[PDB]
């Protein structure tokens, strides 16, 4: 059952990759969808057998590394944590694959797209099912490889080509730290196995654990697009919408969260790292929400929403609430994928395929089915009570105040503003696209129609899972005393009681009041008093709008300062060292030295009795002189060469 779940998606990638020419476009797409569905069913069978029956599955293919005490095998395990990650991964991948059948129907290279899409699914499965960190690193690297081939799928477009490179190189920066963390793990424990390293967490030096997990934290920020390594996330929007739907829901963007949750036994014994994760997640939540309220591209806003939600998972990790982070991760994979699918449905519905929301308006009646999917997903994202997001996101915001520390209190305000912004840009996005006065030409509206059933089918399935999913799965992950030994929580770090009971009743509804109430204020201003938002008049508003529309100027700072200087260092090394001093102390310098010396010696060779006679007589001075003067003669000879 385990082998069928893992390597079946790899079969679909191989079939479409190398046999897609011989079977045609249509059969290639459905065979790939068939392979993912086999993994979907096998995962659900294992979920019942693992979570409910407390059973584990381990398959050991063969040994990989056998260098003295360092033994690494090609082994895959399916525990509670692995099968908990598999459900968002394989299910959303299948629904994205089903979505991709009709969305990509007009693309000339559908066979390759499904080959890359299924390869990414297989890489992510290997990431969460490996029983040691090295098998995780195999999936970790091929996740970036497949994403690079997916973002730059339209390689004839310059922006897509450079965007894919940006995602790869930034993720490789995390991979470099990830390798360093694994090397230190071998240095300290002599192994990378989960069963070995996690059994020594309480006995290892805190400094050693910090260094390993600081490397893990840097690697996590690149994949999860946290502050400092988040520029590539918005550049990923150059790829097709099915890539963005899969990438930002239950994939590479969430890989950083899984790495920290897997390392929970080690992470509990270095509280300083938890403090860094808490602030890094809190800052990213605040920054992402502010940017998304002044953004115009529909996919950029949702991408920024993904960055804001992933940070909410990080702050849960920072307070040692690994169960909270995992549950919000599973729920977020369902309604965020729905947003991208429905956003891509709006882009296909409009004939011009515009993506700027400023050119939208009055789509609510023309495409009601897409609007309802967006509306339901938005409410689930906004943690409206009763929905999946409410049971998964609202508890994390409460946990910040329930921590009752200085950092938790500060992050609570950042999370509270993030929650308020989450409702603000959702209303703003909906109003511009569906409720605003029409901006596109009238010819667009007389040809504006909903898409086919094949595109709709995954969205409806996700829509239902975006309403009832969180309620059914809350007790598995958020129930008190539920056995989740894969995620280790130290007894001193269990704050699920002070979060649940000690909270003032006002804080339980404060995000709701700021969300719905703040959203209504924004909606009223847009409809009747839009003259307020003509921000090109005020100078301070123009700068403030420009500062957040340019994404905290981080992209400009990253390129104009960091990347340019790194390239200039190579230029300085090339000019002054490789082509410079090493040529002066090399062939070019020695040639000039040889030419100067050999020119002098050429004038010393000519037939002359007086010339040779004086030299012979001069050599008689060597006999006369005391030998201690030889070095002075040697210096004198060099002086005459000049």
């Amino acid at each position: 059952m385990i082998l069928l779940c893992i390597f079946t998606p790899f079969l679909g990638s191989l079939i479409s990759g190398f046999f897609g020419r011989y079977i045609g476009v249509n059969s290639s797409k459905w065979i790939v969808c068939l392979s993912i569905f086999v993994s979907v069913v096998s995962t659900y069978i294992l979920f019942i057998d693992v979570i409910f029956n407390e059973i584990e599955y381990t398959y050991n293919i063969m040994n990989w590394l056998n260098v003295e005490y360092l033994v690494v095998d090609w082994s895959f395990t399916i525990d509670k944590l692995s099968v908990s990650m598999l459900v968002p991964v394989v299910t959303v991948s299948f629904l994205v694959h089903l979505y991709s059948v009709s969305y990509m129907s007009h693309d000339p290279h559908q066979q390759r797209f499904f080959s890359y899409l299924s390869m990414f699914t297989f890489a992510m499965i290997v990431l969460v099912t490996g029983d040691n960190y090295l098998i995780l690193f195999v999936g970790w690297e091929f996740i970036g490889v497949a994403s690079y081939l997916l973002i730059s799928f339209w390689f004839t477009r310059f922006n897509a080509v450079k965007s894919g490179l940006s995602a790869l190189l930034i993720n490789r920066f995390g991979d470099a730290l990830l390798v360093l963390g694994l090397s230190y793990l071998v240095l300290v424990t002599g192994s990378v196995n989960y069963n070995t390293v996690f059994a020594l967490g309480s006995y290892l030096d805190v400094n050693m654990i910090t260094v390993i997990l600081i490397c893990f934290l840097v690697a996590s920020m690149a994949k999860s697009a946290q502050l400092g390594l988040h520029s590539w996330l918005l550049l990923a929007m150059e790829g097709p919408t099915p890539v963005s739907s899969l990438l930002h829901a239950a994939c590479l963007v969430i890989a950083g969260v899984f790495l920290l949750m897997r390392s929970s036994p080690l992470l509990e014994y270095t509280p300083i790292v938890l403090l860094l994760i808490l602030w890094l997640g809190g800052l990213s939540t605040l920054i992402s929400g502010l940017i998304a309220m002044v953004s115009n591209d529909i996919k950029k806003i949702i991408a920024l929403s993904t960055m804001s939600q992933v940070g909410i998972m990080m702050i849960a990790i920072g307070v040692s609430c690994y169960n909270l982070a995992l549950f919000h991760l599973i729920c977020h994979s369902f309604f965020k994928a729905l947003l991208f699918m429905s956003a891509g449905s709006v882009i296909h519905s409009i004939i011009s395929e515009y993506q700027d929301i400023r050119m939208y308006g009055g789509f609510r009646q023309f495409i009601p089915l897409a609007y309802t999917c967006i509306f339901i997903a938005s409410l689930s994202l906004m943690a409206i009570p009763g929905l999946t997001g409410f049971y998964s996101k609202d508890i994390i915001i409460e946990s910040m105040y329930g921590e009752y520390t200085f950092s938790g209190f500060i992050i609570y305000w950042f999370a509270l503003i993030s929650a308020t912004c989450t409702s603000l840009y959702s209303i703003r996005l909906i109003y511009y696209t569906f409720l605003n006065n029409p901006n596109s030409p009238k010819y667009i509206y007389i040809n504006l129609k909903e898409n086919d059933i094949v595109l709709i089918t995954p969205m409806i399935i996700l829509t239902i899972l975006s309403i009832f999913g969180g309620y059914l799965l809350r007790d598995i992950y958020l129930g008190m005393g539920s056995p989740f030994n894969e995620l280790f929580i130290h007894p001193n770090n269990l704050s699920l009681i002070e979060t649940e009971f000690s909270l003032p009743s006002i804080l339980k509804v404060l995000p709701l009041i700021t969300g719905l109430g703040g959203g209504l204020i924004l909606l009223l201003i847009y409809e009747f008093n839009y003259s307020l938002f003509l921000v090109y008049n005020n100078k301070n508003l123009s700068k403030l709008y420009s500062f957040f529309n340019q994404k905290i100027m981080f992209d400009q700072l990253l390129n104009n300062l960091i990347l340019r200087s790194g390239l200039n260092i190579g230029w300085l090394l090339n000019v002054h060292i490789d082509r410079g001093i090493l040529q002066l102390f090399g062939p070019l310098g020695l040639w000039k030295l040889s030419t100067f010396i050999s020119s002098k010696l050429n004038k010393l060779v000519f037939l002359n009795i007086g010339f040779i006679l004086e030299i012979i007589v001069l050599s008689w001075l060597l006999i006369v002189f005391k030998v201690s003067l030889l070095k002075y003669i040697l210096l004198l000879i060099i002086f005459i060469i000049l």
Binding site: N560, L561, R564, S565, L567, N568, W571
Partner: peptide
């Protein structure tokens, strides 16, 4: 408006290589 990136020299003398004003082709 537009401005040149950093580390772009104002002058150079590479023998008889033609000397032209540095232009960012991205801005064309």
């Amino acid at each position: 408006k537009s401005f040149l990136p950093h580390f772009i020299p104002k002058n150079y003398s590479y023998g008889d290589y033609p000397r032209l004003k540095p232009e960012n082709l991205q801005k064309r």
